[PDB]
Design a protein around this nucleic acid. Structure first.
Ligand code: DGT
Ligand code: CA
Ligand code: CA
Ligand code: CA
Length: 341
DNA sequence: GTTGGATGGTAGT
DNA sequence: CTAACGCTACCATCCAAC
């Protein structure tokens, strides 16, 4: 079983560099402007030149401009990037039909019926890098291993414009030596909990009672870590089915005034329903980000599908419910559809 | 004692 | 207005309904 994972380099910024080669070789920062005030919002990504200065995905645009004033700041055009992504995804498709698209910029290929071993895998990975570079002028990072998790870990180790194989012996070693925090799915919270039990490496999970481990971090997370640690994790490549779709927007200013909020909510509904496109949801949730950035939410599941008209009516009821049961001012408002038929 | 919908926490973006 | 997008996925906990 061999899995080939491709993850495009500084994707949004790189697309813009391809669309405008004069940008190449300079700091570039792609931004999600919230509309709230001048330069309100956060950064989607930035190129490696910008990262040298601390500018990276997630930080506030005002933090970016503070530490890197003279960079080029462009707004995010997701649709433009999505078009390039789909074209690349189809190139990937001509090397393997067995493909898992995980984000706008990455995908997992099962290549066990195309290559004999890790060498031929690596050569395929160089072939794939070349093709994407010729056809779209995008550089990507390939990670090859016996499974999805390790293909992703391998890519992470080789980022910008690399390629890396983690073969079976290195898996054994990484199960022993890789800091547990560096395992996909273990964030800050879960890392702390694993330190309190003195569990620092994947191998440390095989020397602890299942029941004691599941109590601390949860059943699913325990079964995941133990499975990895046993060298048994083997989730296969499967087409991803979108489970939920929605839209959230930042308001020009905080409010508890229904008539002031409604317009934003109704925009979120229209654009959500456009993104649904054929799908019929049975569950709707209204999501509100309060003045102190806490996320609160009210929803409802129907026994049948939700029509646009019901989405308008219920979302208003749900938003009324949030205002009734929570006293803080609202700052962002959104909606989310799930349980598709 | 067991389902699953409502709500929220954690993760990776 | 004065920092903190916009998104998706998965799972834990609560607690009325079984
Ligand atoms: N809005 C938003 N978009 C993000 C965020 N993180 C990543 N993205 C978008 C922009 C990225 O170009 C694209 C792919 O993200 P990646 O996580 O793979 O990082 P990126 O390609 O930008 O740099 P790379 O060398 O992987 O690290 O997804 C984020 O926090 N917010
Ligand atoms: Ca990625
Ligand atoms: Ca990337
Ligand atoms: Ca971590």
């Amino acid at each position: 079983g061999i899995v080939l994972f491709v993850d495009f380099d500084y994707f949004y910024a790189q697309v813009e560099e391809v669309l405008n080669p004069s940008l190449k070789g300079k700091p570039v920062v792609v931004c999600v402007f919230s509309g709230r005030f001048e330069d309100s919002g956060a950064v989607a990504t930035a190129n490696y030149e910008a990262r040298k200065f601390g500018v990276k995905a997630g930080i506030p645009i005002v933090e970016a401009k503070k530490i890197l004033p003279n960079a080029v700041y462009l707004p995010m055009r997701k649709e433009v990037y999505q078009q390039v992504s789909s074209r690349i995804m189809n190139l990937l498709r001509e090397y393997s039909e067995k493909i898992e698209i995980a984000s706008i910029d990455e995908a997992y290929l099962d290549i066990s019926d195309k290559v004999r071993d890790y060498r031929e895998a690596y050569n395929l990975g160089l072939e794939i890098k070349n093709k994407i570079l010729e056809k779209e002028k995008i550089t990507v990072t390939v990670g090859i291993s016996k499974n999805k998790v390790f293909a992703k870990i391998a890519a992470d180790m080789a980022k910008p414009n690399g390629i890396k194989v983690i073969d079976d012996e290195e898996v054994k070693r990484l199960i022993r030596e890789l800091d547990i925090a560096d395992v996909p799915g273990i964030g800050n919270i879960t890392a702390e909990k694993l330190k309190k039990l003195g569990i620092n490496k994947l191998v440390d999970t095989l020397s602890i009672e299942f029941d004691k481990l599941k109590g601390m971090i949860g059943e699913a997370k325990a079964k995941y870590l133990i499975s990895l640690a046993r060298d048994e994790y083997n989730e296969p490549i499967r087409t991803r089915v979108r489970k939920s779709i929605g839209r959230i927007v930042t308001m020009k200013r905080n409010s508890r005034n229904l008539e002031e909020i409604k317009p934003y909510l109704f925009r979120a509904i229209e654009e959500s329903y456009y993104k649904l496109d054929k799908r019929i949801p049975k569950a709707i949730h209204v999501v509100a980000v309060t003045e102190d950035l806490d996320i609160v939410s009210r929803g409802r599941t129907f026994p049948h599908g939700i029509s646009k008209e019901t989405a308008y009516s219920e979302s208003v009821k749900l938003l009324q419910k949030i205002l009734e049961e929570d006293e803080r001012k609202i700052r962002r408002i959104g909606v989310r559809f799930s349980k598709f038929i």
